[PDB]
Amino acid sequence: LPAHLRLQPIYWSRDDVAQWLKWAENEFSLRPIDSNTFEMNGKALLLLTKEDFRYRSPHSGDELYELLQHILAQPAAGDELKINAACRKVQHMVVKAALLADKFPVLHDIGNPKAIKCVPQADVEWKFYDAQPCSDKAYKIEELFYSYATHSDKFTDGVCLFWNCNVDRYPANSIVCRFDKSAFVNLKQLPFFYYSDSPCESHVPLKSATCITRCNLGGAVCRHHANEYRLYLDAYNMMISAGFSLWVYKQFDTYNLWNTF
């Protein structure tokens, strides 16, 4: 199965659906159907009835409908290396943007046992904490088990980072990634965005209010950022499809990112 088809169908693009048709034709020895037989994305495909499937493909619609129900009942397992890599791409993006937007002087990285900075080039004092630091990095990690009930009065300067570190309740000055609600009362959900400050370069147009780049100030995204935006969205979808969600301090404002230009 192609990588995108390992995502929940709600995330499949119009192109992913046509590759699903092609994969199923060979896996199940079906009569070839025209690639434009289901000209829609996965969100739309999930709204069709079985009768609609049968009308659009008299020779295989019912099989395809039932195949989709099986895919929907038993989601395909994901590849840890790809998922891990997708998460780390999102972590760098989000934390970089937060530091640029709000200029925190300190970052308190809670649950980081390897003392690795996800944004090594930011102008910020990086502090690491973990309940069980890796023995080869404990010399620069504070041994600490975070609980809101014990530490809510601490780490009040700068921002706190809880990247997949499940604690009882997150403090208000936090950036959080959680794997699957009272823990999040101090925060808000982080909606998708893409931010980049790399140089624009030319050589399908991208229309998106969430592409925060200099070239999108005027609505004419360059080829380079269009490509990087699509690659980033694929990584984001892989992480969200796998059960991760992102939460952020309530003052996080994407207009602070636009103002960097």
Ligand SMILES: Nc1ncnc2c1ncn2[C@@H]1O[C@H](C[C@@H](N)CC[C@H](N)C(=O)O)[C@@H](O)[C@H]1O
């Ligand atoms: N309440 C806690 N306080 C501090 N560290 C914790 C706590 N609970 C779990 N940990 C540590 O958090 C880490 C969780 C891991 N999933 C690693 C998360 C890490 N931020 C990452 O991006 O990979 C482990 O290293 C735990 O030792």
Ligand SMILES: [Zn+2]
């Ligand atoms: Zn650009």
